[PDB]
C-alpha cells in the first residue's frame, strides 16, 4: 500500500523546519561517522597533497522523523536530503572536493522507525599533507584527514567514530605504487577557535616509501658511472690525453643526470639524502679526474711514480667508495 | 521549545525585504571583518599570482533581525543565508575563487538577540601579485589582498578591521618551501571610482625567497663546469684533440644548462641575477677556450712565451673567477 507510505512521509515533512537542528535548545545531537576508503589515487610530493575516494556515512537521530505502522527501513530518493536537516560537516585540510553526480548525485537517505537517519555520500577529496623530505627517498610520512563541524559548537553537536576502530574499512585493500600503508589511526577530540569549541575527528595513515624504483632510477646510474671511472686506472697512460677528456665527459654526464633528477622533485630548501649521495659520487669522480690529471702531468719525467700512483688509486678508490657506501647505508637504515 | 523558536524565526523573516540594506535610507551600516588564514598553497611567478585559503568572517547589525525572550545566540543552518541581506564584498585582485561545498557549502550564520549577524565563509582565492624579478632569486616580494564593496558607496557601508591589529590570525600557519613570511600589514582607506567612493581594506604580506634550492640546483653545476674548464690549463699543448674536445664539451654543457634554466621561467624582458651569473660563467669558459686558441696560435714561434702564458693562466683564471663571485655576491647580498 504505497498511499499509506506517501501519507506518512507527507505527514513527517509537514511543518518541518530545516533551519533548526534536532533537539534545538537542548542537549547536543550526537553524530556517528563511518568511512569506507575506496581508493587512494595519487600522492604528490610536489603539491604536498594526496587524493582519496571514500563512502562517507553519517548517523544521527531526529525524533521529528519517527514513524509508526511501517515495519521497514525507508530508503528515500536522495532529493529528500534537500528537505531535511543534515550536519554541516567539512574537512579542514582539503583543497578541492566534490560529490560524484553520475548518473545522479551519489547520495543516500535512509530513515528508521525510531527516527534514526542514515546519510551517505561518495566523495573524492584532495587533502593537504605536509611532508618531511630530509630522509627522502628513505622517508616515512603521516597524512591525516580532519573532520569538523563548521557552524555548530560542542554545545550543539558531538562527533564519534561509530564502531570504534572498526569505523574505517578498506584500508588493507589499498595498493600504492610508491608507498605502503604501515598503520592507520582514529582520534577524537575538541578544537577551540575564537568562536568556540568544535568537535574533531582525525583519521591518519603512516606511509613508508618503497625503495626499488629509486634503486633502479637514480642510485644505480650514479654507482655505475663511479665504477666506470675506475676502469681508467687499468688502462696504460700515454701522451694522447684521451683519459682526461673521457673523465671530464663522464663528470659532465653525471652533472647532466643529476640536474634532471632534481628536475623531477619539488623545490625544497634543504639537502636530501639522495642529494648527499649524489654529491658524494661527484666528489669521488672529481677526485679520480684530478688524480689522472696529476699522473698525466708528472708521467713524462717520472714514469715509475706515475705507475705507483695509478696502482695505489686502483686499490684506494674501491675501498673508500665501499666505506662511504657502508656509512651512508648505515646512517639512513 | 522548538515550536516557539520556529515561530520566532518565522516572525523575524515575515515582512523582511532582502532587497534593502539595514538602515536603508539612513546612516551607513558598519561591517567588521576578520580573516583566519589556513594556508598559502602556492606562489607562482609564471602566472604572477598566489593561492590563499581563509576563513572570512563579517560582523554587522541588522535591527530587523532583533528578537526577545530567548537569551541565546541562534546558530542557524547556512541555507538561511539565502534569505538574509549580506554585504556585497568582493576581492579586486582575485582571478578565480570558490566557496568549499563539501559536505555542504562551508558557510555559517549566527544571530544575536540585539540583531547582530555573524556571517562566515571558507574561501580559496587565487589572487594576482605582480613581481619584480630583477633580483631573482634573491628578490623580496609584497603580495596583497584588496577587499572592497561593489555596489554600496561610503554613504551606505563602512569597513573596519575588527580588533585592529589582531583582525588577521593564522599567519604562523603559512608554510612555503620557497618563501618565508617577514611581515604582514593591515590598511583601511577609500578608493574613488567614477561611480563614487568605496571603502577598501588591504592585507599585505612581505615574502623573502630562500636561496638554498638555487645554490643546490643552479649555481653549483655552472661553478663545477667552470672549474672543470680549468683542467685544460694543466694539459700539454701537444694534445690538441683532447683540449678541443674539453672545450667543446664544456661549451655544449653550459648551453644546455642555460637553455633549460631559462626555459623554466617566465619570459620577462629584463635580466635577472641568475642570468648575469650564467652569462659570466659562459664568458669565463669561452675565454679559457680562446686562451687555448691563442696559445696554439703562438707556440710554434715562441714556445717559452706560450708555456709562460699557460702557467700564468693557471693562476689568473681562478683568481678572476673568485673576484667575479665576490663582487656578484656582495652586490646581490
Amino acid at each position, epitope marked *: 500500500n504505497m498511499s499509506f507510505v506517501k501519507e506518512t512521509v507527507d505527514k513527517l515533512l509537514k511543518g518541518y523546519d530545516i533551519r533548526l537542528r534536532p533537539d534545538f535548545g537542548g542537549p547536543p545531537v550526537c553524530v556517528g561517522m563511518n568511512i569506507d576508503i575506496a581508493s587512494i589515487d595519487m600522492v604528490s610530493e610536489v603539491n604536498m597533497d594526496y587524493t582519496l575516494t571514500m563512502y562517507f556515512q553519517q548517523y544521527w537521530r531526529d525524533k521529528r522523523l519517527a514513524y509508526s505502522g511501517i515495519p521497514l527501513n525507508l530508503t528515500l530518493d536522495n532529493r529528500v536530503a534537500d528537505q531535511l536537516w543534515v550536519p554541516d560537516t567539512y574537512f*579542514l*585540510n582539503d583543497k578541492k572536493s566534490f560529490v560524484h553526480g553520475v548518473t545522479v548525485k551519489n547520495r543516500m537517505i535512509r530513515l528508521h522507525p525510531d527516527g534514526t537517519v542514515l546519510y551517505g555520500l561518495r566523495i573524492t577529496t584532495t587533502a593537504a599533507c*605536509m611532508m*618531511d623530505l630530509r630522509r627522502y627517498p628513505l622517508d616515512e610520512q*603521516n597524512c*591525516t584527514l*580532519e573532520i569538523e563541524s563548521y557552524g555548530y559548537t560542542t554545545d550543539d553537536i558531538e562527533f564519534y567514530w561509530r564502531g570504534g576502530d572498526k569505523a574505517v574499512t578498506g584500508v588493507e585493500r589499498i595498493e600504492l605504487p610508491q608507498f605502503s600503508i604501515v598503520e592507520h589511526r582514529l582520534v577524537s577530540r*575538541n*578544537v*577551540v*577557535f*575564537a568562536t568556540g*569549541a568544535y568537535p574533531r575527528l582525525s583519521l591518519s595513515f603512516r606511509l613508508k616509501r618503497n625503495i626499488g624504483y629509486f634503486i633502479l632510477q637514480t642510485y644505480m646510474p650514479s654507482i655505475l658511472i663511479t665504477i666506470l671511472s675506475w676502469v681508467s686506472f687499468w688502462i696504460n697512460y700515454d701522451a694522447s690525453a684521451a683519459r682526461v677528456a673521457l673523465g671530464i665527459t663522464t663528470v659532465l654526464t653525471m652533472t647532466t643526470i643529476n640536474t634532471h633528477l632534481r628536475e623531477t622533485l619539488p623545490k625544497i630548501p634543504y639537502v636530501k639524502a639522495i642529494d648527499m649521495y649524489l654529491m658524494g659520487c661527484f666528489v669521488f669522480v672529481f677526485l679520480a679526474l684530478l688524480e689522472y690529471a696529476f699522473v698525466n702531468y708528472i708521467f713524462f719525467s717520472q714514469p715509475a711514480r706515475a705507475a705507483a700512483i695509478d696502482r695505489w688509486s686502483r686499490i684506494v678508490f674501491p675501498f673508500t667508495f665501499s666505506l662511504f657506501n657502508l656509512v651512508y647505508w648505515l646512517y639512513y637504515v | 521549545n522548538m515550536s516557539f523558536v520556529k515561530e520566532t524565526v518565522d516572525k523575524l523573516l515575515k515582512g523582511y525585504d532582502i532587497r534593502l540594506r539595514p538602515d536603508f535610507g539612513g546612516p551607513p551600516v558598519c561591517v567588521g571583518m576578520n580573516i583566519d588564514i589556513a594556508s598559502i598553497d602556492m606562489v607562482s611567478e609564471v602566472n604572477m599570482d598566489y593561492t590563499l585559503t581563509m576563513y572570512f568572517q563579517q560582523y554587522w547589525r541588522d535591527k530587523r533581525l532583533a528578537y526577545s525572550g530567548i537569551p541565546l545566540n541562534l546558530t542557524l543552518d547556512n541555507r538561511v543565508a539565502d534569505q538574509l541581506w549580506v554585504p556585497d564584498t568582493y576581492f579586486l585582485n582575485d582571478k578565480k575563487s570558490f566557496v568549499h561545498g563539501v559536505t555542504v557549502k562551508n558557510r555559517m550564520i549566527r544571530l544575536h538577540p540585539d540583531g547582530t549577524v555573524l556571517y562566515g565563509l571558507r574561501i580559496t582565492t587565487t589572487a594576482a601579485c605582480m613581481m619584480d624579478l630583477r633580483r631573482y632569486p634573491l628578490d623580496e616580494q609584497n603580495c596583497t589582498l584588496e577587499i572592497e564593496s561593489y555596489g554600496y558607496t561610503t554613504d551606505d557601508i563602512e569597513f573596519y578591521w575588527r580588533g585592529g591589529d589582531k583582525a588577521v*590570525t593564522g*599567519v*604562523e*600557519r*603559512i*608554510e612555503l618551501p620557497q618563501f*618565508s*613570511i617577514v611581515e604582514h600589514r593591515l590598511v583601511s582607506r577609500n578608493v574613488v571610482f567614477a561611480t563614487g567612493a568605496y571603502p577598501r581594506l588591504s592585507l599585505s604580506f612581505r615574502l623573502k625567497r630562500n636561496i638554498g634550492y638555487f645554490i643546490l640546483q643552479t649555481y653549483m653545476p655552472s661553478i663545477l663546469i667552470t672549474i672543470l674548464s680549468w683542467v685544460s690549463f694543466w694539459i700539454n699543448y701537444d694534445a690538441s684533440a683532447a683540449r678541443v674536445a674539453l672545450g667543446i664539451t664544456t661549451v655544449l654543457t653550459m648551453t644546455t644548462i642555460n637553455t633549460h634554466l631559462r626555459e623554466t621561467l617566465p619570459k620577462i624582458p629584463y635580466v635577472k641575477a641568475i642570468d648575469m651569473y650564467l652569462m659570466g660563467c659562459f664568458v669565463f669558459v669561452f675565454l679559457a677556450l680562446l686562451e687555448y686558441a691563442f696559445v696554439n696560435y703562438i707556440f710554434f714561434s715562441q714556445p717559452a712565451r706560450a708555456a709562460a702564458i699557460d702557467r700564468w693562466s693557471r693562476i689568473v683564471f681562478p683568481f678572476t673567477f673568485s673576484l667575479f663571485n665576490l663582487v656578484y655576491w656582495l652586490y646581490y647580498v
Partner: nanobody, 105 residues
Framework: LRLSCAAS????????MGWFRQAPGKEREFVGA????????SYADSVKDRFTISRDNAKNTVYLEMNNLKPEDTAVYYC??????????????????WGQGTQVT
C-alpha cells in the same frame, strides 16, 4: 632570566611551541608562540616589547628571555607543543605535549 625548552622526537608533526604561565589563583595564561621553521613569533599584550622568544633547530631549543620583570610575573611556567591543525594559538586545550612546570618569583 631565561627559560629553555628542548624538544625531541616528532617535532615535524608539532611545528609550533607555545609558552604558558599559571598563577596560584588564576587559570593558565598564554605568553607567546614560536614556529620551528618560519621563525614567526607571536606575543600576548602583557609581555609585548618585554619578553622575547627565539628558536634554534641545531639542538631543537626555544628560549624565552624575560626582561623588565614585575611582581605580577610570579607564576609557574610551562612549555607546550601544538599540532598543525590544532586550532587557535591562545588556548591551552589545543596543545598536546606539555613540559614540566618551572617556578619563577
Amino acid at each position: 632570566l631565561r627559560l629553555s625548552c628542548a624538544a625531541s622526537g616528532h617535532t615535524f608533526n608539532y611545528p609550533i611551541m607555545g609558552w604558558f604561565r599559571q598563577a596560584p589563583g588564576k587559570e593558565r595564561e598564554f605568553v607567546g608562540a614560536i614556529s620551528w621553521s618560519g621563525g614567526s613569533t607571536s606575543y600576548a599584550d602583557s609581555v609585548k616589547d618585554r619578553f622575547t622568544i627565539s628558536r634554534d633547530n641545531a639542538k631543537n631549543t626555544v628560549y624565552l628571555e624575560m626582561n623588565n620583570l614585575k611582581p605580577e610575573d610570579t607564576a609557574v611556567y610551562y612549555c607546550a607543543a601544538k599540532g598543525r591543525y590544532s586550532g587557535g594559538l591562545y588556548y591551552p586545550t589545543n596543545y598536546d605535549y606539555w613540559g614540566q612546570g618551572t617556578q619563577v618569583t
